[PDB]
Scaffold this motif. Structure first.
Motif, short mmCIF file in Angstrom:
data_model
loop_
_atom_site.label_atom_id
_atom_site.label_comp_id
_atom_site.label_asym_id
_atom_site.label_seq_id
_atom_site.Cartn_x
_atom_site.Cartn_y
_atom_site.Cartn_z
N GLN A 17 0.83 -1.21 0.00
CA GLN A 17 0.00 0.00 0.00
C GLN A 17 0.87 1.27 0.00
O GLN A 17 0.47 2.26 -0.62
N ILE A 18 2.05 1.26 0.66
CA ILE A 18 2.95 2.42 0.61
C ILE A 18 3.34 2.63 -0.86
O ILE A 18 3.24 3.74 -1.38
N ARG A 19 3.76 1.54 -1.52
CA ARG A 19 4.16 1.59 -2.92
C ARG A 19 2.97 2.06 -3.80
O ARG A 19 3.16 2.98 -4.60
N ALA A 20 1.75 1.53 -3.56
CA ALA A 20 0.56 1.91 -4.33
C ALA A 20 0.22 3.41 -4.20
O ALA A 20 -0.34 4.00 -5.14
N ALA A 21 0.57 4.01 -3.04
CA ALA A 21 0.32 5.43 -2.76
C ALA A 21 1.33 6.35 -3.46
O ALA A 21 1.21 7.57 -3.39
N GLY A 22 2.33 5.77 -4.13
CA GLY A 22 3.29 6.58 -4.87
C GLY A 22 4.55 6.95 -4.12
O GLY A 22 5.38 7.67 -4.66
N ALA A 23 4.72 6.44 -2.89
CA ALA A 23 5.93 6.72 -2.13
C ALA A 23 7.03 5.72 -2.47
O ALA A 23 6.74 4.59 -2.86
N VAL A 24 8.29 6.14 -2.31
CA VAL A 24 9.41 5.22 -2.58
C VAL A 24 9.92 4.57 -1.27
O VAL A 24 10.88 3.79 -1.30
N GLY A 25 9.28 4.88 -0.15
CA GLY A 25 9.67 4.32 1.13
C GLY A 25 9.02 5.00 2.31
O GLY A 25 8.09 5.80 2.15
N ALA A 26 9.55 4.73 3.51
CA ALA A 26 8.96 5.31 4.71
C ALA A 26 10.03 5.67 5.73
O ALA A 26 11.08 5.02 5.76
N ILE A 27 9.75 6.68 6.56
CA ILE A 27 10.61 7.09 7.69
C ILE A 27 9.87 6.54 8.88
O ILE A 27 8.72 6.93 9.11
N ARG A 28 10.50 5.61 9.61
CA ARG A 28 9.83 4.85 10.64
C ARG A 28 10.48 4.98 12.02
O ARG A 28 11.70 5.13 12.15
N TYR A 29 9.64 4.88 13.07
CA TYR A 29 10.06 5.09 14.43
C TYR A 29 10.82 3.94 15.03
O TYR A 29 10.32 2.81 15.11
N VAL A 30 11.99 4.28 15.59
CA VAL A 30 12.77 3.32 16.38
C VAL A 30 12.62 3.77 17.86
O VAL A 30 13.60 3.92 18.59
N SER A 31 11.36 3.96 18.29
CA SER A 31 11.00 4.44 19.63
C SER A 31 9.87 3.65 20.25
O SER A 31 9.04 3.06 19.55
N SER A 54 11.52 -3.54 2.52
CA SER A 54 12.68 -3.87 1.68
C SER A 54 12.30 -4.85 0.57
O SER A 54 12.75 -4.72 -0.57
N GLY A 55 11.44 -5.83 0.92
CA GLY A 55 10.97 -6.85 -0.01
C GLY A 55 10.24 -6.30 -1.23
O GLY A 55 10.32 -6.86 -2.32
N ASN A 56 9.55 -5.16 -1.05
CA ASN A 56 8.79 -4.48 -2.08
C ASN A 56 9.61 -3.37 -2.74
O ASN A 56 9.04 -2.52 -3.44
N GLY A 57 10.94 -3.39 -2.52
CA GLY A 57 11.89 -2.44 -3.10
C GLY A 57 11.76 -1.05 -2.51
O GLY A 57 12.14 -0.07 -3.16
N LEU A 58 11.19 -0.94 -1.30
CA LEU A 58 10.99 0.37 -0.68
C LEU A 58 12.17 0.77 0.21
O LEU A 58 12.84 -0.11 0.78
N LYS A 59 12.43 2.09 0.32
CA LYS A 59 13.49 2.64 1.16
C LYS A 59 13.03 2.71 2.59
O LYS A 59 11.85 2.97 2.86
N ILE A 60 13.96 2.54 3.54
CA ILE A 60 13.62 2.70 4.95
C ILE A 60 14.56 3.72 5.54
O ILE A 60 15.76 3.68 5.25
N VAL A 61 14.03 4.56 6.43
CA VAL A 61 14.80 5.56 7.16
C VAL A 61 14.35 5.50 8.61
O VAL A 61 13.14 5.40 8.85
N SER A 62 15.27 5.65 9.56
CA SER A 62 14.89 5.59 10.98
C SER A 62 14.78 6.97 11.63
O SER A 62 15.63 7.83 11.40
N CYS A 63 13.76 7.16 12.48
CA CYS A 63 13.65 8.38 13.25
C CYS A 63 13.26 8.04 14.67
O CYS A 63 12.74 6.95 14.93
N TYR A 64 13.53 8.93 15.58
CA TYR A 64 13.26 8.68 16.98
C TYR A 64 12.44 9.78 17.58
O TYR A 64 12.87 10.93 17.53
N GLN A 65 11.33 9.44 18.21
CA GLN A 65 10.55 10.40 19.01
C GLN A 65 9.80 9.62 20.05
O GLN A 65 8.95 8.81 19.70
#
Length: 204
Positions: A17-31, A54-65
């Motif tokens: 669904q992230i890929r279907a929405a037109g995004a190339v990845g997600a910034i995700r919480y490590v919190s 990663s399996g769907n060829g999407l980028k991952i980025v980590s953020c903390y809050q």
């Protein structure tokens, strides 16, 4: 922009669904989820979700809050920095995040220069002392990014618009949050971020 990354706290979205929405990845919480935050099913990213992205060829980025407002993470300065940075590092590694990837520490505020110098500088220096200067990312407005760049604090910068000039993108920013909760993907409210530089903190 070089592509869009979504960020979200309310839930986990299937990578298809992230890929279907037109995004190339997600910034995700490590919190963790703070008290009053059990609804934040998007915190922390788990290994199975990272494998799906990663399996769907999407980028991952980590953020903390972890905290917010009266419990903002940076209020406790150096002592708070080491506690939050250790936990972020642990959660990043548990989700299969490599040590070559940074973690964007959040400054989810519009601080004064007094707050920056007295609290945010020791907070961000603690992040550098735990995971390293090269791994320290900063989510902040463009004013705070400029102060950090000028002090040589942090290596990655993700701009938010609370206290940034209208229509402005800081020339040092790797990522820019351009839309807050104006979209729902897989039943989850998302924020939209533009990628500005080719090396922006992606895991791979």
């Amino acid at each position: 922009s070089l592509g869009t990354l979504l960020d979200y706290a309310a839930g986990v979205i299937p990578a298809s669904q992230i890929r279907a929405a037109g995004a190339v990845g997600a910034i995700r919480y490590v919190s963790d989820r703070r008290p009053g935050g059990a609804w934040m099913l998007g915190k922390p990213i788990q290994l199975s979700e990272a494998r799906d992205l990663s399996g769907n060829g999407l980028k991952i980025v980590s953020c903390y809050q972890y905290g917010k407002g009266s419990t903002a993470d940076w209020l406790g300065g150096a002592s708070a920095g080491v506690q939050h940075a250790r936990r972020g590092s642990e959660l990043h590694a548990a989700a299969g995040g490599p040590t070559s990837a940074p973690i964007y520490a959040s400054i989810d505020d519009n601080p004064s220069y007094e707050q920056y110098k007295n609290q945010i500088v020791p907070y961000l220096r603690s992040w550098e002392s735990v995971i390293g200067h090269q791994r320290t990312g900063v989510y902040a407005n463009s004013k705070t990014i400029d102060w950090a760049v000028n002090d040589g604090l942090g290596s990655y910068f993700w701009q938010h618009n609370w206290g940034s000039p209208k229509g402005y993108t800081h020339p040092a920013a790797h990522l820019h949050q351009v839309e807050i909760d104006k979209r729902k993907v897989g039943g989850v409210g998302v924020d939209v971020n533009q990628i500005l530089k080719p090396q922006f903190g992606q895991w791979a």
